[PDB]
RNA sequence: AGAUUUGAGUAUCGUAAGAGGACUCCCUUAACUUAAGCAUAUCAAUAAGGGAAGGAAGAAAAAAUAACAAUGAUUUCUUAAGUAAUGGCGAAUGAAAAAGAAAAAGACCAAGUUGAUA
RNA sequence: UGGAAGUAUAAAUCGAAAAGGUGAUAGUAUUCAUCAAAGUCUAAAUAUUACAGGAAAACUGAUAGCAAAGAAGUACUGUGAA
RNA sequence: GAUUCACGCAGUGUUAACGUGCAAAUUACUUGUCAUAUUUGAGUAUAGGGGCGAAAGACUCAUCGAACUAUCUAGUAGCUGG
RNA sequence: AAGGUUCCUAAACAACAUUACUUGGAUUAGGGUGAAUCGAUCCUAAAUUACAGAUGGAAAUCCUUAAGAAA
RNA sequence: AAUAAAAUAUUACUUUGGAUAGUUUAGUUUCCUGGGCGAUGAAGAACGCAAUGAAUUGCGAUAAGUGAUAGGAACAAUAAAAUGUGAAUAUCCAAAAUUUGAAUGCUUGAAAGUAUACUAAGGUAUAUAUGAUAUUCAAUAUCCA
């Protein structure tokens, strides 16, 4: 909604912050298997239930 | 991290906060330099100064608390932060002196009929 | 109209996040958490919920202060 | 033969396995040894009487009892208070 | 079988009284000395409609005999009472319509 | 006015709570199942629900066995023993003394006595 | 409860003592035997599939072995318990 | 708690369309209705041998002649398949 | 209400929108939400929950000013 | 009667798929030693902190880490700086330890908050039950001038 509580907005901001990918430099480390963030979601693909 | 403990330890109580105020002000301009596209050498200086503040604060707090412990060494009522490290269970257990208390009747018997040392010939 | 049509009016929350367990199980009208058993002091645990016990219990978190004590 | 097996209750949680048996021997023996080291005649297993067994089925066999009666200590001229401290069991 | 509607009525969930716009409790004033050995005079300020009951209710206003102030009552209207009427309650009250007597 | 009794507020120094519950001590009158149906019985101190603790807990020093050429606190193991007994005497349930070992240890209150009483 | 004319607990009523309990077939009597209830503590021998730290194996070898050999009670589902 | 039209609503008929659909109940025309026993939002109350029902065993999250979920539970099968 | 960055800009089109896409509510990276006067905060409505009390083997239930040296 | 496009059959090579074989920083079971939490604020939850991080890991406004004691030359994906005047690394140690949570001044929904006292801001204390001591009281409850 337009109106939201203070704590609820910060938990909304963190969900925005965690919807990012692996930085390129992290992918060039030796013996690295993490290429994509499998905890990714999109607004029109999955609702985050909060 | 370039501050050196010996340099800190030689400083006075006021010189701690005089350095601390200057150290915080130095880092405030370094956060700005990181935002405004400063040189990588300034970013490395930013990482260092964060440790001097941590290093400086550790000395002031340890010296303050150590002096506090000496103040309350003979005190009857010691603040809980200065009491010996024990678990919650330990502070409830009866002391070994109280665990070994004997009534006067049993105390005198254990001194009049003690467990003798002996052996049996075969 | 018990199927697709009746789902359009679902825009009112029943549960929201709970302060003690962080899950969306706080019932707004019952004023209690379906998962962690809020204001009730004891945590809500049941023997038939053995999987529920292995999901949130001791050792499932950081153990910020107990990790030093038992190591000590 | 008419079978009589009381397995209709939950016997699986009633099963006791003796896998600790070979390790009980080591544990008890090490404590018996440690007792003699501490104070040697403490494990001396204080002297006990020679009492008969009960019933006519067993009464002709002697076996160790528990402690001498206070009449047996007087007959042997032993103080009952000193008896317990020199490895003599007493059963008033 | 199920529970009959008569059983469900004793729970009082949707069968609670719809008493939100009701005026109050219609009753005499509490018994005291002035109602037992004298008379108190009340003034019928207004006659009003109490929802859920057929009789009108009168807002009678007695003076406080022991303290300074008023004492607002809520009587059930006797047929004939009018606004601005004086009614007397007590052991010595006259036998007129609207007066409260032992 | 004074001597007490009882009940409160406040201050100081502490104590309980919550986590865990594999093992330990208890509360509660489940049912599926078996009986070739089923209604007592069985499943069964079993499930779920509830309370309390410790590194172990519980028990513990005879108002106990026995009928002997007698024993002797408690606990645990072997045996007694699928025995005595219980049961629509059906299905089924079911001990303990003796005897053999591990370990061993006994002490206090109350009541009674002493009162230039403490 | 194995305890069978009541083995144990509890509730209603009743309720002792110049003592008395028990000897499992109810009852009265006389002997015999053995204990002496209605308060408290007590190490040792015993248990353990929480959890932590180790060691072993005629155990499994990625559809197996824990649900999980990778950011596994994670991704994902449900209003929610799950 | 008169007759009708309209914004809306329902669901009489076509037993039309569709019937691996636009849709796990929808579409088109036709019909009925379209403010006082009216329509409707949010808050709040009522819970499983229970609730709620102008009463159809109807409704209680696509679940109802007894919801969903987990445990007892690998319930039992003289029956069926391997 | 619900959604939660879907808003705007630039680069870019492998996948996705039953053909295609230079387009995008899609990919990547930055930017964006300014209150003494608008609202929440304040008040009470249906209703809801505490200390003490009452009840219950238990978990817990009842009571909301009645039972209280309380409010 | 006729052809071999299709159809069928075998082998080699490629393809789709991931069986089989080799392998294990993962499990299972038994046994041994402990069984060491919390009002001195636990377990759990949330948020935040790395030069470039989204998860995870470690940590708490001193932040992927501080002091001290051991330790002796590294780290690395890419740069920087510091470094034998002591880098990595380890610790039953010291300092520090955000919002919550039994959560405990009061309120709490996703709620933003807030009163008093002590020592403008900041920090402490104030829940309920409860033992002991001190102190202020209440009741003609028992006596009593």
UniProtKB/Swiss-Prot annotation, chain E:
Signal peptide positions (record): none
Superkingdom per UniProt: Eukaryota
Compartments in which it is found: Cytoplasm
Stated role: Component of the large ribosomal subunit. The ribosome is a large ribonucleoprotein complex responsible for the synthesis of proteins in the cell.
Family: Belongs to the universal ribosomal protein uL2 family.
Subunit structure: Component of the large ribosomal subunit.
Protein name per its UniProtKB record: Large ribosomal subunit protein uL2
């Amino acid at each position: 909604t337009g109106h939201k509580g203070f704590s609820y907005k910060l938990k909304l901001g963190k969900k925005i912050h965690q919807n990012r990918g692996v930085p390129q430099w992290f992918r060039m480390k030796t013996g690295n298997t993490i290429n994509y963030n499998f905890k990714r979601r999109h607004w029109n693909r999955r609702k985050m239930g909060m | 991290a370039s501050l050196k403990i010996s340099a800190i330890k030689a400083m006075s109580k006021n010189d701690m906060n005089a350095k601390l105020i200057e150290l915080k002000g130095e880092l405030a301009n370094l956060r700005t330099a990181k935002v405004t596209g400063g040189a990588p050498s300034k970013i490395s200086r930013l990482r260092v100064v964060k440790k001097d503040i941590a290093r400086l604060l550790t000395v002031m707090n340890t010296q303050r608390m150590e002096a506090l412990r000496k103040y309350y060494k003979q005190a009857k009522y010691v603040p809980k932060e200065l009491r010996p490290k024990t678990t919650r269970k330990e502070r409830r257990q009866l002391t070994k002196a109280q665990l070994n208390l004997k009534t006067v009747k049993a105390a005198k018997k254990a001194q009049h009929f003690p467990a003798r040392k002996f052996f049996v010939l075969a | 109209t018990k199927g697709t049509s009746c789902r359009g009016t679902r825009h009112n929350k029943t549960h929201i996040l709970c302060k003690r367990c962080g899950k969306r199980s706080w019932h707004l009208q019952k004023q209690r958490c379906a998962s962690c058993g809020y204001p009730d002091a004891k945590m809500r645990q049941y023997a038939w919920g053995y999987k529920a016990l292995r999901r949130r219990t001791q050792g499932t978190g950081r153990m910020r202060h107990l990790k030093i004590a038992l190591k000590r | 033969a008419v079978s009589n097996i009381h397995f209709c209750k939950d016997w699986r949680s009633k099963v006791h396995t003796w896998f600790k048996q070979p390790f009980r021997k080591i544990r008890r023996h090490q404590t018996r040894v440690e007792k003699a080291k501490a104070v040697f005649p403490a494990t001396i297993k204080s002297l006990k009487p020679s009492v008969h067994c009960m019933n006519q089925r067993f009464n002709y066999k002697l076996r160790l009892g528990r402690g001498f009666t206070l009449k047996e200590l007087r007959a042997a001229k032993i103080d009952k208070n000193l008896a317990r401290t020199i490895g003599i069991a007493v059963d008033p | 079988g199920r529970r009959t509607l008569s059983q469900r009525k004793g729970r009082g969930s949707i069968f609670k009284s719809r008493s939100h716009h009701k005026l109050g409790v219609a009753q005499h004033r509490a018994i005291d000395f002035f109602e037992r050995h004298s008379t108190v005079r009340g003034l019928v300020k207004s006659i009003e409609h109490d929802p859920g009951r057929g009789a009108p209710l009168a807002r009678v206003v007695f003076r406080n005999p022991r303290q300074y102030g008023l004492d607002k009552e809520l009587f059930i209207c006797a047929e004939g009472l009018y606004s601005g009427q004086y009614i007397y309650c007590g052991s010595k009250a006259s036998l007129h319509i609207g007066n409260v007597l032992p």
